[PDB]
Design brief:
- The chain has 167 residues and is of the alpha/beta class.
- It has a single domain, classed as Leucine Aminopeptidase, subunit E, domain 1 (3-Layer(aba) Sandwich).
- Helix content is 34%, strand content 20%.
- It is built from six helices and seven strands; from the N terminus they run ββαβααββαβαβα.
- A hairpin with a 6-residue loop joins strand 4 and strand 5.
- It binds ligand RK9.
- This is Papain-like protease nsp3.
- It is a multi-pass membrane protein.
């Protein structure tokens, strides 16, 4: 028994909720929150900018130090950094950005990073301004992640479409 409440049951291991991931993390303070990162950990917009803004830019400061030491992530890759005021840990995961011409096949590789964590609060990878169809991202999530994932979808109209079209 954990502290996520309000999640509609999609599968055995996937629950889903209509929420902004930032406001969700502030309430639950999960062990792991997933950021929809880019390879440079440049948190300008979307979930990354919203998560980063909620940490008063401490996420960006930590991220810049990580990149200066280690170089960029791979598309499909991840790193674990601090969760700051939002979670114990932030798993920064790079899904492919369709709008930059990255290979959508790497979405499954991105979701495999979630399997290293027993429980996560996460968004649908490659969604929003990453340019992929959320219905596809949800399908890959359900077919790839085996650990317990609590998904957040910000737009009500999209959340409703995701639930109503889920097979
Ligand atoms: C101002 C606060 C705010 O925007 N919070 C949000 N929380 C969620 C779950 C969304 S999302 O539903 O759009 N998922 C989503 C997934 C991947 C990338 C992007 C992008 N860019 C978005 S946005």
């Amino acid at each position: 028994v954990n502290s996520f409440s309000g999640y509609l049951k999609l599968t055995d291991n996937v629950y889903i909720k209509n929420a902004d991931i930032v406001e969700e993390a502030k309430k639950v303070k999960p062990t792991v929150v997933v950021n929809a990162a880019n390879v440079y950990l440049k948190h300008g917009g979307g979930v990354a900018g919203a998560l980063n803004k909620a940490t008063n830019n401490a996420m960006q400061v930590e991220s810049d130090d990580y990149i200066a030491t280690n170089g960029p992530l791979k598309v499909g890759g991840s790193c674990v950094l601090s969760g700051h005021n939002l979670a114990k840990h932030c798993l920064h995961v790079v899904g492919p950005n369709v709008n930059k011409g990255e290979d959508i096949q790497l979405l499954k590789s991105a979701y495999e990073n979630f399997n290293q964590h027993e429980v996560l609060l996460a968004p649908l990878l490659s969604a929003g301004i990453f340019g992929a169809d959320p219905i596809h991202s949800l399908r890959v999530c359900v077919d790839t992640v085996r650990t317990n994932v609590y998904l957040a979808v910000f737009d009500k109209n999209l959340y409703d479409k995701l639930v109503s079209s889920f097979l």
